[PDB]
Scaffold this active site. Structure first.
Site, mmCIF file in Angstrom:
data_model
loop_
_atom_site.group_PDB
_atom_site.id
_atom_site.type_symbol
_atom_site.label_atom_id
_atom_site.label_comp_id
_atom_site.label_asym_id
_atom_site.label_seq_id
_atom_site.Cartn_x
_atom_site.Cartn_y
_atom_site.Cartn_z
ATOM 1 N N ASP A 41 -20.663 25.204 -39.955
ATOM 2 C CA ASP A 41 -20.094 24.933 -41.383
ATOM 3 C C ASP A 41 -18.304 24.960 -41.515
ATOM 4 O O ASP A 41 -17.870 25.899 -40.837
ATOM 5 C CB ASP A 41 -20.700 26.257 -42.329
ATOM 6 C CG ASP A 41 -19.809 26.427 -43.439
ATOM 7 O OD1 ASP A 41 -19.366 25.581 -44.367
ATOM 8 O OD2 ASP A 41 -19.913 27.468 -44.230
ATOM 9 N N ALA A 42 -17.841 24.054 -41.962
ATOM 10 C CA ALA A 42 -16.259 23.921 -42.204
ATOM 11 C C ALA A 42 -15.641 24.906 -42.802
ATOM 12 O O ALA A 42 -14.598 25.430 -42.156
ATOM 13 C CB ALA A 42 -16.090 22.604 -42.836
ATOM 14 N N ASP A 78 -14.719 15.022 -45.917
ATOM 15 C CA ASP A 78 -15.856 13.821 -45.788
ATOM 16 C C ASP A 78 -17.541 14.387 -46.099
ATOM 17 O O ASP A 78 -18.410 14.209 -45.222
ATOM 18 C CB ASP A 78 -15.740 13.362 -44.489
ATOM 19 C CG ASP A 78 -16.450 11.917 -44.105
ATOM 20 O OD1 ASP A 78 -16.801 11.297 -45.242
ATOM 21 O OD2 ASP A 78 -16.387 11.383 -43.112
HETATM 22 N N1 ADN Z 1 -20.721 23.102 -44.912
HETATM 23 C C1 ADN Z 1 -20.446 21.975 -44.086
HETATM 24 N N2 ADN Z 1 -19.657 21.786 -43.122
HETATM 25 C C2 ADN Z 1 -19.494 20.795 -42.154
HETATM 26 N N3 ADN Z 1 -20.011 19.596 -42.485
HETATM 27 C C3 ADN Z 1 -21.099 19.799 -43.628
HETATM 28 C C4 ADN Z 1 -21.279 20.787 -44.490
HETATM 29 N N4 ADN Z 1 -22.379 20.498 -45.265
HETATM 30 C C5 ADN Z 1 -22.521 19.074 -44.951
HETATM 31 N N5 ADN Z 1 -21.823 18.509 -44.012
HETATM 32 C C6 ADN Z 1 -22.042 17.311 -43.275
HETATM 33 O O1 ADN Z 1 -21.420 16.503 -44.154
HETATM 34 C C7 ADN Z 1 -21.750 15.021 -43.831
HETATM 35 C C8 ADN Z 1 -21.908 14.271 -45.206
HETATM 36 O O2 ADN Z 1 -22.933 15.070 -45.846
HETATM 37 C C9 ADN Z 1 -22.972 15.320 -43.010
HETATM 38 O O3 ADN Z 1 -22.658 14.769 -41.810
HETATM 39 C C10 ADN Z 1 -23.172 16.719 -43.160
HETATM 40 O O4 ADN Z 1 -23.785 17.125 -41.944
#
Ligand code: ADN
Ligand code: ADN
Ligand code: ADN
Ligand code: ADN
Lengths: 292, 292, 292, 292
Positions: free
Chosen positions: C137-138, C155
């Site tokens: 999770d970012a 993104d």
């Molecule tokens: N909390 C998050 N942190 C990082 N990437 C995410 C998160 N939630 C969704 N994604 C990614 O974002 C992209 C676009 O939905 C997808 O590849 C998904 O896996």
């Protein structure tokens, strides 16, 4: 939910199947070729975007095409298929113990090679030592050879002027090319297009009336094929009588056919050959005859 | 090419009709109501977004539901319809010279009023002085009234548990409510759901089997309905036999029914009552009985 | 004509692409994954049955998301991607000669592995030694690590409450987690959902307004994406101005980006950042702020 | 859920709107005519099964077609529409206080009479004493009359050889028929087909290059129309310069146009006329000129 195969049955009517996948494809100058994996009907062979054979119910078309004819014959040994690249007509014919040779004569080598690899239900059929595959127009093949048959099976597309099949449904073809190639007691059977309460006037009644100009005994019959969204027809034709009871059909099935039919017993055939009021009226009043 | 009514008639299967317009809408406590003008099938009544009847082929369903029952009766004079708000069942009954009273007992007044307003084909029928319209659940109506009938006709929806219709297909309903309301020599007929090669196991074989637990003589039969893209079924039941030749049926139709049937003659009925191998097998081997 | 992928992109609105095949499927704890081969838009990545990227026009979204942010920075060297498992965002970043490190932080390893396996266009990018892939999770990743970045790129999916993405669009996230991780003169850019004349009110104006509560300089912009059948939006945010002529942008692109952009030149960006009357009005009058 | 209007935008691309109803229809030898009531776009005028005008967003097309041209004119008093049966072009033109006379010249009286009754948004326009309706081919009308105009508006279908519109987009028409009919300072504007990143090469760039052979100053511009599933184009053309600022456009709108535009302000126009990189390249390299 998301991927669909769609077919315009009539200009005004569409029939759509959800897809698992698009398995393989091929193409030839004759027709586009595809094998879909459909959720409601399993694998489905589509030629020129028209569904031909679905896994869940192709047995209905192929039993109905093949078995009545062979079972009305006293001892059918040699058979010629006009068409049959898909392989299931040959499969059903090779279930008969009385058969010595089946000739499949398809115009399109690409259908044959595709279906031989990918319609694995027909794999033993394609490898059966009693089967000869010929790549030719069935009309030229029949014309240029003298060999005679006990049963000739029409497994072609519907008659459409200018298409490669129309000539194989004319009076002249039947009289001057086909009949000479049937042995004594020989029976011809052809697929005869839709046979629904309204759709039966498209080709079914004309194919019936055409055959009626050439063979003394002509028996039209029909059955529902769920995947085609309609009742389908076939026509038997012979210069020897075609009149057996349900029970005699059942005894011959038991004696001559390997494995149990899934769709057809003799009662089912008698029902099939008893057409409804409006359909009988159409066929009986029909004056149109295919010529050229 | 551009306007379509689409219905998912089985999961993963869509059936689409080209639309000319949406003629009238309506509603009730029980269902949404629509009359569509469709290209392939003319005016089409749709209830909760499920097609019920289409102008170009509803004659098939209604001739099949009505005429066999009455024709097998020596003198059918009074008839009770369970459901039938659409009015075509009553239309077909009233073609019989023998008939002096028809009760239509439909639970939804709005359906009746809608069809009375907008189905031109049934205007005369709805205004025939032989017809009494009753608005009530047919189970309650049959219980609370002492009158017996020569023929009782089920023109209800399919039995799916929790439906307003389920209770009208149970052994107890038939035994305790329905049978006591048949006169001596009386005949019951009901619509019996899909009767296709694989769809016949949803309700047709259960409805057949359930009626087998109550009446001495039970005859199931089926016919293709183009607009349903399936074979549909009905079941006759009686404690007197239901056994007439095609020739006898043709005679009775000539003597008792005003004008020519469009779908049904004698041979058509025989054929309809001769089911296919797999369907007959299912019926003859079926064990489920509707109860609650 | 016969095989279709269909998506209800708004309620009562279906958008359908002719299909050549379904190339590969996949799945994870978070979503279903599909790569379709479509006729109008080439290979298409679909997540939970929602189109993400289409081979023939994903350059538009990815050029628009990436290049404006980096071009407005004097020397952007390190960049963190929130999400971006598809790999095209990283592809576009790595075109910049200034860039020495790209972190892609996507929560779904299966998406990353799928796109790495099957998106030919991003093979080189995924294997550029400047790229670090992190699976997390970012929000958690940005919190638990002290490293700052010149550019941070959102993104992610749209913010809809209860989504795994909502928290990455809140005022507090931006204030407390994101901003502290930007270097001096750092720029944030995020995708900002639909930006059509009526769809811009779903999330674009809120995302703009929310960023306005945290950064001194906020520039929203938009471009048509054919395969989405809508205009799509992005938003730049910084505490230094974001203000460059078309001519200055063209120069910076010539000096910093390897090869010619397919979509974006300087005048294209100016135009993109000049929103229409009703959209500008909504943005300038918007009051909602994302919080939890 | 059940009734849908479907449109093949490209051979490979379908766009489908759920329907409330099919309100009215008409037809002429020129084209089929229908008015649908759609859930996502409200009422929709469809000619030959192609959507032309949707209630929720037709204001975008008609403001963009009409206003730039009139606002770049110092004092536009007399205007001729080629097409415009639908009535909304006339509506927008009649919002200008400087206008004394509008001539709508449509080939198809049936479109005019239909839209006058059924597109009630245009009712005051159709009854405005400044409007003259002429039923004619706009090319013969322009050729056979000497009257000159301040603005001529092309509201025709796309140029398709053999259709009734192609001749109204040729170099010879523009030079020898149209230009002589423009007063000093006269401005021509025409709809110019799709203008998307790929679809702009179909007619937009050719219409641009064609005009460029005839008028000294030619300004192409484009905007998204949600219901058309694409960016649409228009082209202004004049022998007097076409170069006004956003703010001067805004002052003239305020002074001369009754009511507030919903889509267009001057900034929106400047954005519209700043085409993207690939679109500008196409238009600038275009060598094709429509002739005959
Ligand atoms: N909390 C998050 N942190 C990082 N990437 C995410 C998160 N939630 C969704 N994604 C990614 O974002 C992209 C676009 O939905 C997808 O590849 C998904 O896996
Ligand atoms: N003239 C013909 N002779 C033999 N087979 C044919 C002919 N025309 C069509 N076919 C084959 O008939 C099958 C059914 O259309 C296809 O396999 C097709 O190749
Ligand atoms: N319990 C019931 N009694 C009578 N008619 C019914 C009942 N349930 C449904 N119907 C009617 O059956 C018809 C077919 O569904 C409808 O007109 C419906 O109103
Ligand atoms: N040559 C023409 N002159 C005038 N109007 C036309 C011509 N061709 C098409 N139209 C009209 O243009 C409108 C847009 O297609 C329609 O109202 C149509 O009737």
């Amino acid at each position: 939910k998301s991927c669909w195969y769609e077919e315009e049955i009539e200009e005004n009517l569409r029939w759509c199947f959800a897809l698992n996948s698009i398995l393989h494809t091929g193409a030839s100058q004759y027709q586009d070729i595809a094998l879909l994996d459909t959720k409601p009907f399993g694998k489905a062979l589509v030629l020129d975007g028209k569904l031909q054979s679905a896994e869940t119910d192709e047995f209905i078309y192929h039993e109905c095409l093949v078995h009545p004819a062979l079972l009305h014959h006293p001892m059918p040994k040699n058979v010629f298929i006009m068409g049959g690249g898909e392989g299931s007509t040959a499969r059903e014919l090779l279930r008969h113990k009385t058969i010595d040779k089946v000739v499949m004569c398809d115009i399109d080598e690409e259908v044959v090679e595709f279906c031989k690899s990918y319609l694995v239900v027909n794999k033993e059929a394609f490898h059966d030592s009693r089967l000869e595959v010929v790549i030719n127009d069935a009309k030229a093949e029949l014309e240029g050879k003298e060999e005679k048959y006990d049963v000739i099976v029409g497994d072609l597309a519907d008659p459409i002027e200018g298409g490669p099949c129309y000539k194989l449904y004319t009076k002249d073809f039947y009289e001057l090319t086909l009949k000479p190639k049937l042995k004594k007691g020989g029976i011809f059977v052809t697929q005869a297009g839709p046979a629904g309460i309204f759709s039966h006037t498209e080709v079914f009644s004309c194919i019936y009336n055409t055959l009626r100009q050439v063979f003394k005994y002509v028996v039209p019959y029909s059955a529902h094929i769920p995947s085609y969204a309609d009742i389908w027809g076939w026509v038997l034709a012979s210069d020897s009588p075609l009149d057996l009871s349900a029970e005699e059909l059942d005894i011959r099935m038991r004696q001559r056919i390997i494995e149990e039919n899934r769709y057809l017993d003799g009662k089912t055939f008698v029902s099939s050959s008893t057409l409804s009021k409006a359909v009988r009226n159409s066929l009986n009043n029909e004056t149109h005859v295919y010529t050229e």
